[PDB]
Amino acid sequence: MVYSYTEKKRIRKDFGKRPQVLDVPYLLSIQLDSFQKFIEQDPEGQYGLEAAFRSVFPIQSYSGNSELQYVSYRLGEPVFDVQECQIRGVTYSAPLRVKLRLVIYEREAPEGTVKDIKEQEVYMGEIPLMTDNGTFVINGTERVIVSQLHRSPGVFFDSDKGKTHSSGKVLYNARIIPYRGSWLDFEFDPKDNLFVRIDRRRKLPATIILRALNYTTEQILDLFFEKVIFEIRDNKLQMELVPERLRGETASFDIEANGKVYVEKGRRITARHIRQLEKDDVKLIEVPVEYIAGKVVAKDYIDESTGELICAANMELSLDLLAKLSQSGHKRIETLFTNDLDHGPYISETLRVDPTNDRLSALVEIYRMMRPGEPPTREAAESLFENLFFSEDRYDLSAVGRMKFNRSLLREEIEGSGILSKDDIIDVMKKLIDIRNGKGEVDDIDHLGNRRIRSVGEMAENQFRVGLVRVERAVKERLSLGDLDTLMPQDMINAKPISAAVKEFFGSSQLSQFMDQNNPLSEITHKRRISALGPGGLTRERAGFEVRDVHPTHYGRVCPIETPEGPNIGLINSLSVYAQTNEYGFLETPYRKVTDGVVTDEIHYLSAIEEGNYVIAQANSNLDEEGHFVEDLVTCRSKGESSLFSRDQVDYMDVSTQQVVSVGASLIPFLEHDDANRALMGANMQRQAVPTLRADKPLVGTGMERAVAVDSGVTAVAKRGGVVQYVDASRIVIKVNEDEMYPGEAGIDIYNLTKYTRSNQNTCINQMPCVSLGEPVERGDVLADGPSTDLGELALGQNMRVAFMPWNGYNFEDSILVSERVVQEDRFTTIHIQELACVSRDTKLGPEEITADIPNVGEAALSKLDESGIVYIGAEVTGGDILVGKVTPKGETQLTPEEKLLRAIFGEKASDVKDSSLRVPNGVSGTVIDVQVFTRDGVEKDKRALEIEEMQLKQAKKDLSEELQILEAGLFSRIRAVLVAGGVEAEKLDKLPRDRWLELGLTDEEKQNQLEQLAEQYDELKHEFEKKLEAKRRKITQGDDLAPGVLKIVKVYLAVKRRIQPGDKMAGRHGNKGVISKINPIEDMPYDENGTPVDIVLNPLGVPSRMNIGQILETHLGMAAKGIGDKINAMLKQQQEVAKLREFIQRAYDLGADVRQKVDLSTFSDEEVMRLAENLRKGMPIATPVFDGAKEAEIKELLKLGDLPTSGQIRLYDGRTGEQFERPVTVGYMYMLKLNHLVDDKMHARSTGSYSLVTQQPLGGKAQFGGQRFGEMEVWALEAYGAAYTLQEMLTVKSDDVNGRTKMYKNIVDGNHQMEPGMPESFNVLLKEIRSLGINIELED
Amino acid sequence: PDLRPLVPLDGGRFATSDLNDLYRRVINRNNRLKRLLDLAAPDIIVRNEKRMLQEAVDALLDNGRRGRAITGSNKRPLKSLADMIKGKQGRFRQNLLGKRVDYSGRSVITVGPYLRLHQCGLPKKMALELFKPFIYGKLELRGLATTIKAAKKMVEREEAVVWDILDEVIREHPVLLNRAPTLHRLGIQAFEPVLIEGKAIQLHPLVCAAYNADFDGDQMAVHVPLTLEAQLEARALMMSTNNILSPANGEPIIVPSQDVVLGLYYMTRDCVNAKGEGMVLTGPKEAERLYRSGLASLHARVKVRITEYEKDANGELVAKTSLKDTTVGRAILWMIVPKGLPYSIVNQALGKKAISKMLNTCYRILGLKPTVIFADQIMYTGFAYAARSGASVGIDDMVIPEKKHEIISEAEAEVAEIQEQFQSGLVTAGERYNKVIDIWAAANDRVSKAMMDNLQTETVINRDGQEEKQVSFNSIYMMADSGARGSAAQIRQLAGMRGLMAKPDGSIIETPITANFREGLNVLQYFISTHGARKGLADTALKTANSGYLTRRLVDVAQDLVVTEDDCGTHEGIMMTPVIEGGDVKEPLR
Amino acid sequence: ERMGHIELASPTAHIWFLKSLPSRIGLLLDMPLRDIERVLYFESYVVIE
Amino acid sequence: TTRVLTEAAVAGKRDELRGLKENVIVGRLIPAGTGYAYHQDRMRRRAAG
């Protein structure tokens, strides 16, 4: 039994066969957790400000015996609030201050300090504080930073083969990507040669790095290569062979294994021969001599007598070499194997290519490649090389990079340094060689286990560290200079650089941007968006065909559907419902553990790596009561290959069908009946919705709408409240019960609604109350309803009656016919708020004042303007009427007898000012909602600016006096209680306080003393109230600061009511959209048998071409709900008994298969019955899961109870000819929504306006009455038509030909219709530009 | 300096950028060097400033070629003189008719149900602004505007007489329209403007196919011809009434495919026999009886007298009375038919290709005006009957064959047998995979056959024979057969088993998708289905640009051609033969 | 429509030539492009005569 | 443009406004369609003078 006091008013019917196990999470933890942990005081330094400090904080002078340290950082409290910052337009940030410590040591003492300055902290800027809704108030405006997805730092063994080779061969390169520092990569040549490349520059020899890494040739050869003994003594030439160690190479001749011949001459080696030569112990066997020649010597040797470099390394053996080396050097020689069948040198080939064999010679080459000039001096090259990769302070990639490194190298250890190591590169090269020879599988860039996301916390920390190191450099400079001083710790500590850097990172960034405020769903999914571009990932939308392809590992991590259809397709994705971030950078997917068939309810989060190991079943499976399965074989995925498996093979279980779906797609019913593309466009355009005046609850639901509305933070919810005392249109106060009440507080919770506020999309946001009065409200219950919301459910759109029938071509392809009733019903009516602002801009000639004394204007225009020049609140305006009368002072003139005479006649103007008043742009009409004025301190004109301050102060005193009154009432009740039984009737206390007769002495020992104590309690409370009101007043009228050029700022907001009309972009929820083409009257449209006409006529041919069965299902459920609502409304009209309606609605609820158990008359009392019915008196709220919705038969019985035909087709009669139609038409009630693409905004045209200074062309894209632009492809089409005169008209009359435009205008006025070409000024500009170069050009005759 | 305006950003600072900063640098460098040149500087120093001056000059000419000079606080380099010449932001840029248009901009597209082809619906909001100079001229001519300022004041006040004179001016004046993306010459057409109180224009539906519009969110531009010769070119060459056939291959561009086709198919049909089967009349009475009572368009075995007109005589037609039986709809449309065309040709199911041939033959024989007005009346009747027909759709329209489950059982049994014989070791992985593919393909084919058999002409109706399997009346079936909307492949995805749709990159999954949207879909099936849609969307988006680039290259390379000669008087040419390769001829010498 | 000029006493070459696909100065003097670029920066000191 | 401009400057050639793009850039009737007859008359006149 569910109470759901806030929801018990109206309960939506669900149809979920599977039972809910895990609830939907807060769905916004990712946005807030990163910020919280970044600003969190952690006991250990692992991230956030702590690690950013401990990175490079200790500052030491250049042998100055001085040091700089800190204790801890303290964040200052915000000066203003969210609403305060919004109104002021300031950025909501947080001050920061850290206690420091400067310690100096005198000379001639090892670490012997003499003084400390660990007594003064310093201040460093403000950190932009993040809101309660995962947002920021930067410059008053609200913006969202989208999380960035990129490849995790680590090593990548990529093939990079195919057609890109252009040689019919495969490639094998390795790439390492540090989180910071240069990029070191190694490419493979088609000549079987590796090459070192850094930062995509000129390649380098593979082995030059090893020589630079103090490695001799013999060391490298003995390490990477295996050497056979080659023990040839007394010219026996007897070779040690292990057939198991190496085999597969045919034997030519003279082959024996332990005496008798085991492998015949000219016969291929066989596994039998290998087996017998391994089983039979084989010693050094005489071989033919040519085997020496092909083999290469391992190490550079010397003769026994003389130490020459005879038989130097990387040299094949020679027969003439052979005898002399045998007689001089030795008899047994280290050599190689070079089993090209399974191996390949690939380095010994490159070894001879290397021109430098000394470490110094190799070290100069890398510096030369880095620096083309300024050759090193045995000091620059080594320092540069060490700082390049072996530097902790300059490479320092990450711990996650080391973890990925070890994981790729199968190392149990996961903790390492940020620097590299020689053995690391050695094993990387060896692994590359093994892979090239064949040892395993290649990596996968698109695999989600190889790519990680980034949150705002990590990037904020990176920005802070970048700003911090720059300042620390100057700090070290100032410590090394003039160190002999005991000044305060502010010698080089500047907050300006760090503050500017953090502001720029927050302010202007590719990832930083405003959110779409039109829809709460749009906001919440915008905060759940994921990208790959920006400072990393992908630099541009180009260079990718499969990167945007759907990897199989996107199963339960991101939505495979929610993505834009623009050129950024496949680059922006939304998280799944239950997706959670990994510890470092990845995503985790919860799953239910399956043990020996039964499924354990415990959840486990898995990555792309773990998921590919175990066995995970599909949610579309039958479960027994005990956790067993109806069928032994169930389809499961192991390594991306779904197939049936026995119940003993499954290892894990899904959570829900929505685990693969994002929030936006989850809200569309019957996804399994609609095309993927259709769902894609529907979800995309759903974000483009706009709320109307009356938000209407959808009748068909998915359940997640309630969670979306509550977690959106757009409405008001109840926190620790017990009962509502007073309700206002914008003010809400709830009295919490003593159970959830802690002492020391009054015990009242006030909430003020948002009323008609402009959004980032210039829309209107308003929060409507829900409860009536005196209603016991529980914690977590919604209190108000914002835009596109209804009773805690996101209600964006209206449920409109529709039909699928071609009506005279008005639904030809994508044209939508609308009802005059809807216009009369005012459905889809939109309200838009526009902002206009003005500034004074004090000049050299003088200040600019707003005194409403505008010359050369009539009093009629001035009628609507107030004394200071503003328009009265609530007034209406059309066209270009003046808003605020501002004037610009003019420089004085001489005596000017004409001007002197005019002033002696007219005066009060003397041409001292110019009309700089503020007026409406043309083609704009509306009314003013409110005005705002901002004046900087130091100027106190304030003609009528006191009114808004007075209103604010009245609001503050009103909502501050209430808690004081409540506490006073409690204290006075206490004092009335204490005078009881003291001989004092309550009548005296009721008449006057009198301080209870000023301690008359009811007890004379405690009554006097308790009365006194409570008297100072009252006095202290009075003082606290006075202090609070004074402080708030100071915070209100303190004034603001503006730009230095600006003097004062005035802002005005206006309301516009836009009504539906032909040309509006109208759409549904199934990837279906249309345009309004006609407002048909009600009478023309067809009507049913009962005379109720349809509302919307829609084309029935769209579905077959686009697979939109979900639309028809929506129609059938619409009839179900409409029949139920009409029946219950009729029952209500009849004024029947409670029991009949109760049993009727219980029947309406308990029906269907086993989905959910809920019964009335046990939880809901009588007094809830009529209100619950009146809630759902116009329809049945029905919820349908994403992939567990109702069935066709089910909706058939639904329609049966509705007294409706199961077919869904109903006869209609023409509204025009009054004739019955054959082929009865299915009708529908569609939860249709209006989009932002409204015709009044697209309304644009021009005849002739101002032109550009350059090229003398008209403005363009509607920028102050612009004009449309022509194109080259258009004139190609025109030339194919070949209307040359039209082309000349375009090029001359409507173009930059200044002398031609006026001529043509005068001709048209005179009706001449003659065209005078002239010659375009753009050509003149081109000619001048060519002549600006040293180029001769001229036009001949 | 005029071509390089100061462009004050804040008003306080002009900040002349990308044009004068290079100039300033070079100027001060040259001044310093020339002043130093008179002071006998050391050779190294003066050579250094000479090198720096040469570098500055080169960057001023071509910054991108050598070195890198950036703007203040922006890593973006400066726009040099070549930069404003070549590239996508030079002067070879939108100066070749890429300039802005004074009289055009951002109109919205709606449906022109009425307002026949030689017209266009120009909302009054569009008017009274574009033709404003014409309004001023007419007002001055009519004596109602003594002064220009008075005319402007009256126009801004929007008087009724202003509307009257606007209507007078617009009456005999053509206008042209242009779809912004067009791949052919026919993207621009001229129409007669008509004022309707609204905000969006009504394009005639038949022309929308040429415009490639689809009535979704779309924008339109309008251009007004001013000179008389411009209007003459508009009415003789830009006019829709002249552009009927395709200039690419020769097919008639104007070809209805929407509700008109299905309405035509429906009006000309017969279940078995409607009310009044045996009635015989003249043919004008057909509508008389259908509208009132006694007859329905589905009536069969109806004879009438048809006076066919045939142009057998040279340039002359003769009448011919005929008494063939037909249906109600054909007799009704016969009045719409002009004289020249015969009746036996239109005595059929009258599908989409049928009406295409109707238009082709009517234009070929009669001419331009008759076929134009005939098409107008045809589309009028098509809308009238489509509204009349109703033509509903419902979950009961499509039928899932019952044998589908048995076919699935047999296919899965065969799959199990293949798996068993594979585990037996006689079959390899590739052979078994190919066999499974073939088995599933055969199952798909038989399912398609079964659903078509369920949907084809299998519908017994009461009659003296009581067994009359005539064409069913499934709306999907009519729209697929007539070809107005839908195809066999699409309906295969709707009633029966979906298919393979298995292509991650190039491979094919062994297990196909066995369902249809009517019965919902599996989570796994829906997940695996989206790959093809994603690939198709990506292909479209990435190939639009490639197609545009190819078209631009083609038009650039093939611009110089023009007809300046009549005859070459040459006997050299090309032998032309039919293409005969493979199984048969792919196209005749026709 | 009016021009302004600068004397530029020091000699100066044109980057458009001797830098495109054909080296105009190189094609005229039969002189390698690399050496031309080197002497264009006062660091090659080619002989005159 | 840059390479083409350098080549044309080196050659010192002319346009003669024969190409349709030349008429487009200049802003005069193209020798095609309606403008074909006018351009033919102009060419005949220029042949005479």
Descriptive keywords:
part of a larger assembly, 4 chains, A: 1341 residues, alpha+beta, Dna-directed Rna Polymerase Ii 140kd Polypeptide, Chain: B, domain 3, seven-stranded mixed sheet, five-stranded antiparallel sheet, B: 590 residues, five-stranded mixed sheet, three-stranded mixed sheet, 17 helices, 11% strand, DNA-directed RNA polymerase subunit beta' (chain B), ribonucleoside binding (chain A), DNA-dir_RNA_pol_bsu_external_1 (chain A), DNA-directed RNA polymerase (chain A)
Structural account:
The structure is cut from a larger assembly and holds one copy of chain A (1341 residues) and three copies of chain B. In chain A, a hairpin with a 3-residue loop joins strand 10 (184-189) and strand 11 (193-198). Chain A is an alpha+beta fold. Chain A is globular, with a radius of gyration of 42 Å. The longest helix of chain A is centred in the C-terminal third of the chain and has 34 residues, at 946-979. Helix content of chain A is 29%, strand content 17%. Helices cover 41% and strands 11% of the residues of chain B. The longest helix of chain B has 35 residues, at 523-557. In chain B, the strands form six sheets. Chain B has a five-stranded mixed sheet with strand order 6-5-9-3-8. Chain B has a three-stranded mixed sheet with strand order 10-11-14. Chain B is extended, with a radius of gyration of 35 Å. In chain B, helix 3 (132-141) crosses helix 5 (160-171). The A-D interface holds A 1275, 1279, 1281-1285, 1287-1288, 1291-1292, 1317, 1319-1320, 1323, 1335-1336, 1340 and D 5, 9, 14, 20, 23-30, 32-36, 38.
CATH-assigned fold name of the largest domain in chain A: Dna-directed Rna Polymerase Ii 140kd Polypeptide, Chain: B, Domain 6
The main sheet of chain A comes to: 7 strands, mixed
The number of E-state strands of chain B comes to: 16
Question: Tell me, what is the CATH class of the largest domain in chain A?
Answer: Mainly Beta
Helix content of chain B: 40-55%
Number of distinct helices of chain B? 17
Strand proportion of chain A, as a percent range, falls in 15-25%
The coarse overall form of chain B would be extended
Shape, per Cα inertia axes of chain A: globular
Structural class by SSE content of chain B: alpha+beta
- Give the helix level of chain A as a range of percent: 25-40%
Q: CATH-wise, what's the superfamily of the largest domain in chain A?
A: DNA-directed RNA polymerase, subunit 2, domain 6
**What spatial order of strands do you see in the largest sheet of chain B?**
6-5-9-3-8
Distance between the termini of chain B: 66 Å
Strand content of chain B: 5-15%
Which value, in Å, is the CA radius of gyration of chain A?
42 Å
Largest interface: A-B, 138 and 124 residues
User: What's the architecture of the largest domain in chain A in CATH terms?
Assistant: Beta Barrel
Counting DSSP H or I runs of 4 or more residues, the number of helices of chain A is 36
User: Quick one: biggest sheet of chain B?
Assistant: 5 strands, mixed
GO biological process, one term (chain A): regulation of DNA-templated transcription initiation
Organism (chain A): Escherichia coli (strain K12)
InterPro entries (chain A): DNA-dir_RNA_pol_bsu_ext_1_sf, DNA-dir_RNA_pol_bsu_external_1, DNA-dir_RNA_pol_su2, DNA-dir_RNAP_su2_dom, DNA-dir_RNAP_su2_hyb_sf, RNA_pol_bsu_bac, RNA_pol_bsu_CS, RNA_pol_bsu_protrusion
Modified residues (N6-acetyllysine) (chain A): 1022, 1200
